[model samples]
Target: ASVKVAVRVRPFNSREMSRDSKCIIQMSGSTTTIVNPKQPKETPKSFSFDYSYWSHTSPEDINYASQKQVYRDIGEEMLQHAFEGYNVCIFAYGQTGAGKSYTMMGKQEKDQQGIIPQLCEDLFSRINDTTNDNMSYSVEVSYMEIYCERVRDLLNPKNKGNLRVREHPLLGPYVEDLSKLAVTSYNDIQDLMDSGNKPRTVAATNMNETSSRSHAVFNIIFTQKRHDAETNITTKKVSKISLVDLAGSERNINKSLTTLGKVISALAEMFIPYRDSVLTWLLRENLGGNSRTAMVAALSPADINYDETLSTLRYADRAKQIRCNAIINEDPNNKLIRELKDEVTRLRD
Candidate 1:
């Protein structure tokens, strides 16, 4: 029940425009249907999802789903979950040139800003507006990419080695030596994001130029502390939010999609191959475990890409069946643990 799926059909790109393509996708409410022009007489395929965004909306003011709308509908809810101390994940999936990046990281322009920046702005705004004298907040962020099954730290580009993946005694799995930056303002996140993007592996392909060959994951960890007026003690609540932009699922170059499919199948059977690939391994908990997760499946509206479109939809349909057990992440004894460590330090002194 935790894996909520959505679909977004991108506006026709220049390549599709040159071919005089027609949009075969029609969306109404939360249902989207695709017509196969090759066999017009056959009944069109249809699928229902948690949300359906039509980036293909007409020029009318209320028609299109802009960057702001996307954030409002999806990102805002995820932010609320984070404040509630639950881990949240939002990832996009589709073929090459299907508007995945434009929807997740978007253009830097004010009107075109996407989910990541929007979330940053809203997060700091809430912190500034909060008048609770008993509460305090802190946030940290990390950026990384998975290319060819190798993990690369996006923040520190000059670091030569592929960072090793490690298992924590209690935290499940994590990247060894990952770079995490303390961010107190939106500008801090923006600067880190700009720097991280430069290290991404982008190249031209038959499907789309500037295609992302790696999966980029941007993570935010929020910690909140509330002071108990009577007890003179503080309690902490920590939440993790991961925003992911996955590489195009191509049969030739990247098999991340394949590994993910296998993992999902195994998850249904009470087993999961968390070590199958870097992307799946890192996202093991988010996909099928203890996180509130959502997937945005972008689709190409061109007739020529029908096969890949069908494949993506089918993959998303199977993903809808995935179930995750999520609970608020908080340690009731955190304050006691902090005080114990302080006492140990005093004794050593």
Candidate 2:
């Protein structure tokens, strides 16, 4: 499947409001248009994607796309694919303070939660609704960040050392010794998320900067098991869901972010140099590989951020051209036996 791309424009912040910045973004359906404030007569630049969210105003506005709306459109779909036993990934990208975190991990208040929390809650809801005597499910999660080309475990700050990334013969690339804790309910995941965020704050203080320069990834491994009492057989399926919030996209001041752009461009054109940076290397499978992927391009709606916003749009546009081949991950031995049994029955008939 081709990568799903969406662009969202955020409302003016206090700084922009104080400067009396004009809104330079407009959205109609799936089209996002940006005006050149410096040249009023110049034609507006328009981009079309799978989704174009206008969140540049309060909820009272008719065109406002709230957190719920964003989740329903993008998060829900990816969740559906995960249930179907396909690996899925969704990442948000844009300049610092342009709503990347807001869209991925919004406030904890009611109706204010973003895609990650909503998706976690919905996963348990669906599991509760569908679980039966013959079926069971388990969920494991890992959260980490790439800072200064090093991998840090957000869930276990005491480690205090970078994790080594290893490639498996079958599993591709994985971080060695990363924490993957089991979660039975949404509240369990929520508590973990809260604890995970605290370490980010602690690290930010030591570094004298926020997490805006780091690429954060939260991954969920979901396993489903079915027991057939009559046949005395069990079948299992596992799906990995990756939700990423990339470092702010600005000038080429950082190695990982710059390499990410180059990786995206290479995949769009696969001589992909995934080994050039930690972010690209670890996420190789999610980009033009074996996972269904989606990209959210966050945008600032003020004239001051025109160049950065345009760059983000173009980046997302290039991402749309990438194609991925995702397949269901089931117990291979069980699948082979089932197929052989079907072949035998066909031959007898």
Candidate 3:
């Protein structure tokens, strides 16, 4: 069966940025817009002492409650829907430091809002709400970063390298696959986020400090399906939701590169650096083996027309969701696709 796809974006606020460094470009580009005409452009066309060239909104007093709502609230609402068994995407768009991380990983009762915290609160509440009938919320979180073109499991035994997106001859290139990170409680996820958060490459650029240079992905898998002590039903459906906090488009205009900046140097080159790692391989397994990423299923029922692929998006009108999971994650550097094609040639040989 065909699936319905939708695209969502996280919002931006001044609090996520520094008081001194003006967040002109981030605000204009990160707002919830179908098409942000304010996307990045050549520097020569516009120049100014103030950040007016970047910021489209006037500065206002920082309201913790309100600020948290804008970014975190939206994601919360989406998760609420997921609780009812809806495939969802509470993604982190915009360049780094656009409040994506702030919205997903906020502190407790701090007016700082985030998806991780909100989801934990909700999941626990739900488990308790239905506890009488042997109901509980079992959760699993998988964390990873799609750098260059490879996937690296963030919570992968605190290890690095070795991770690689097994280049599947079939699945084209969509990080739609799944991995399980055992998180039995709210604190489990929190601790995981804290540790995973530290390993993420963060640096300062002309736009914002503590900038997230890589895509941080968090999956909250909630299973409430049961035999229904009273009713005899087997294999109830489960909800697997993926949350992605994407790094904003980075442009170096001011300031010098620091220690974290060194990582940015590698991250800036697209997803090539991570492609060699195994994290990417795990995701590719689903996309290629017998899934959407392979060419082997020429007449298979799972295959969809390469051209009509946009029809659902046209009817549904959600390009963000369509484009992101559409098996085309921009494009990996080093022409990984090109080299893989040769591998395909050798396999055929």
User: TM-score per candidate, in order?
Assistant: 0.91, 0.93, 0.52
What is the C-alpha lDDT profile of model 3 across 140-196, one tens digit per residue? Answer: 777777555445666764555535434456634334343577666667777887777
Angstrom error of the Cα, residue 253, model 1: value is 6.0
- Candidate 2 per-residue lDDT, tens place, 63-133, comes to 79999999999999999999999999999999987999899999887688988999999999999998478
- Which window of ten consecutive residues has the lowest lDDT sum in model 3? 293-302
Query: Global lDDT of each model?
Result: 0.83, 0.89, 0.41
Taking all chains together, the TM-score of candidate 3 against the true structure is: 0.52
Error of 3 at 79 (Å): 1.7
In candidate 3, stretches whose alpha carbon ends up further than 4 angstroms from where it belongs are 1-68, 71-73, 107-109, 131-134, 166-179, 202-211, 230-234, 251-349
RMSD of each: 5.0, 2.7, 16.7
- The runs of at least 3 residues in candidate 2 whose Cα sits more than 4 Å from the true structure, single-residue gaps closed, are 201-209, 333-349
**Better TM-score candidate (1, 3):** 1
**Tens-digit lDDT string for candidate 1 (1-349):** 5588888998888889998989988999998899997898999999988888888855365878788888987899889989989889999888878878888888876578878889888999998898999989999999998877778888998886699988788878899999988888888888899889887876655443444668899999899988766456788889889999998865633666678878766665454767777788789889878888888888998887778888878777777888987799777776676777778789999
Off by over 4 Å in 1: 58-61, 204-211, 268-270, 333-349
Residue 245 of model 2, lDDT score: 86
